């Protein structure tokens, strides 16, 4: 119950057995006793580098702006971004360099990241917009049906006169007062609403979520996502070699397959796409953070036989990257082709975001 | 953000039809109650029985409810066995009972 309530502390005994079980219970030794789970901060998900291991050069520290390299390593080949780097109002204003992993769980080289993509510092309001939209959209709207008073199949005639017998005054008695009747304003799939998401807010929240994953250190860049055979055992062997906990209980994996660095593609790899179907915590998404402009061709209820919620008639597809899936899946694996596609789709956006006195210097700088 | 998505329509609240409410607020059906185990106002919550609501469960135990009612033979194949989720699996142990012995709680075989 509420803490400001009499019923909050009315259980005085019977909650705890005075005898402790001889298997797990222990006594408090003192201040030097390291208690499992105890932490000063309120952590509703108290994980560490063993339960939820981070994949990054450094463990995310307050003395570091991000848990990745800030300068290219002299022993690893460095690959710059496919598009030039520009720092807008929200970027981290610092160089971000991440190692590219080989499918043999090895670091082949390193690659510069774009601050506009993985440097857009996260904001809780934007991430909340993203998550709320995703949940309200992913709800099932066909099951929102309910009966109305005019859908009860009773005689359209007053059952008894109002003044005759001791019964109360009623007519058709098919309303909500009776256990068999329906409501005047019932739930209907077409009366429900589907929210609209603008491309600006969607892209901003997705880039904030990517930046949040990078800051937490759970972003991993691989060169390819390919399997020798399209079977599930090959996918599970790849996951076991790459230390991907795709179990229903482990830290899930979110793949963004965009192809290789030399061979990028907007379609998923066929072998990996056929192998990735496993009953666990793994999800593959399209290599894009943008979305199509949503429309509504029934904004005034002109087509009455419409079956479907009010609002956008072009919602975001399921296989798109989103805050809900990013939060549910611990690690985020992204390919170099997906990186290239994100950069190519966000270049003109950040250029139009740029201010005019800086925009006039773009052809000057190249 | 043009009219951000409503928080009440986020699918985390299926409440009883109240006096106040938006046109886009999906309340509970007529004649149906909001909480499943609250047959009466004094009905207790089942200890280990879990009714999966909303999405499809990732791991469905044999004694948990999902689109089904409680049937003894279906939810308890062996009453002396206790099923649980160990390492994203269905692991079954011998059901036990706690008894006071020498000032501590000791585990004895529940069936015996």
């Amino acid at each position: 119950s509420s803490i400001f309530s009499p019923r909050y502390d009315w259980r005085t005994s019977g909650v705890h057995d005075i005898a402790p079980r001889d298997e797990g219970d222990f006594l408090y030794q003192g201040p030097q006793h390291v208690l499992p789970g105890a932490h000063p901060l309120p952590l509703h998900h108290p994980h560490n580098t063993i339960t939820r291991p981070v994949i990054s050069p450094y463990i995310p520290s307050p003395q570091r702006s991000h848990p990745y390299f800030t300068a290219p390593l002299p022993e690893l080949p460095h690959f710059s971004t496919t598009k030039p780097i520009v720092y807008t109002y929200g970027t981290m204003k610092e160089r971000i360099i991440a190692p590219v992993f080989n499918l043999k769980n090895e670091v082949i080289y390193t690659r510069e990241l774009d601050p506009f993509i993985f440097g857009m510092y996260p904001e809780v309001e934007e991430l909340s917009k993203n998550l709320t939209y995703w949940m309200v959209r992913c709800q099932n709207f066909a099951s929102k049906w309910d009966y109305e008073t005019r859908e009860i199949w009773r005689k359209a005639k007053k059952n008894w006169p109002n003044t005759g017998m001791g019964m109360p005054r009623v007519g058709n008695r098919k309303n909500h007062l009776y256990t068999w009747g329906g409501r005047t304003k019932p739930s209907k799939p077409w009366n429900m609403l589907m929210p609209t998401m603008d491309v600006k807010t969607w892209s901003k929240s997705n880039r904030m979520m990517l930046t949040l994953k990078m800051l937490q250190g759970r972003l991993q860049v691989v060169d390819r996502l390919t399997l020798e055979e399209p079977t599930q055992e090959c996918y599970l062997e790849l996951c076991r070699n790459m230390s991907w906990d795709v179990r229903h209980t482990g830290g899930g994996v979110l793949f963004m397959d965009g192809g290789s660095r030399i061979t990028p593609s907007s379609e998923f790899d066929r072998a990996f796409f056929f192998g990735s179907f496993f009953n666990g915590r793994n999800k593959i998404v399209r290599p894009t953070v943008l979305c199509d402009e949503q429309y509504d061709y029934n904004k005034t209820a002109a087509k009455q036989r419409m079956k479907g919620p009010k609002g956008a008639k072009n919602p975001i597809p399921i296989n798109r990257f989103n805050a809900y899936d990013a939060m549910k899946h611990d690690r985020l694996v992204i390919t170099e082709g997906a990186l290239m596609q994100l950069e190519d789709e966000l270049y003109e956006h950040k250029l139009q975001i740029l201010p005019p006195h800086i925009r006039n210097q773009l052809p000057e700088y190249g | 953000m043009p009219r951000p998505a409503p928080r009440f329509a986020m699918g985390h609240m299926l409440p009883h039809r109240s006096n106040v409410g938006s046109q886009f607020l999906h309340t509970q059906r007529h004649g149906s109650r909001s909480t499943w185990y609250k047959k009466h106002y004094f009905s207790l919550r089942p200890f280990a029985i879990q009714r999966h609501h909303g999405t499809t469960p990732r791991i469905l135990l044999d004694r948990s409810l999902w689109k089904s009612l409680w049937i003894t033979k279906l939810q308890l194949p062996d009453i002396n066995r206790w099923e649980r989720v160990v390492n994203s699996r269905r692991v079954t142990e011998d059901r036990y009972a706690f008894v006071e012995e020498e000032g501590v709680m000791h585990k004895v075989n529940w069936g015996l």
Binding site: E148, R150, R154, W180, K188, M306 | -
Partner: peptide, 22 residues
Amino acid sequence: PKMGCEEITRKARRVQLQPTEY
């Protein structure tokens, strides 16, 4: 209503999406 009520076992008029105003 009830789950197996005679009121809902038989079919009746089905309400449609209402038209909006000008």
